Amino acid sequence: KMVNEALVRQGLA
């Protein structure tokens, strides 16, 4: 897990 992936889940979502 990483912030790079936890950002796409919301920010990019």
Output phi, psi for 3, to 5 deg: -60, -30
Please give the span between the terminal C-alpha atoms of the chain, in angstroms, as a whole number: 17
Fill in the DSSP letter of residue 7.
H
Distances in Å between the alpha carbon of 6 and those of 2, 12?
6, 10
SS (H, E, C) the chain: CCHHHHHHHHHHC
Tell me how far apart the alpha carbons of residues 8 and 1 are, in angstroms, rounded to a whole number.
Answer: 12
Tell me how far apart the alpha carbons of residues 12 and 7 are, in angstroms, rounded to a whole number.
Answer: 7
DSSP helix/strand/coil, 13: coil
Contacts 24+ apart (CB under 8 A), 2-6: none
Structure determined via: NMR
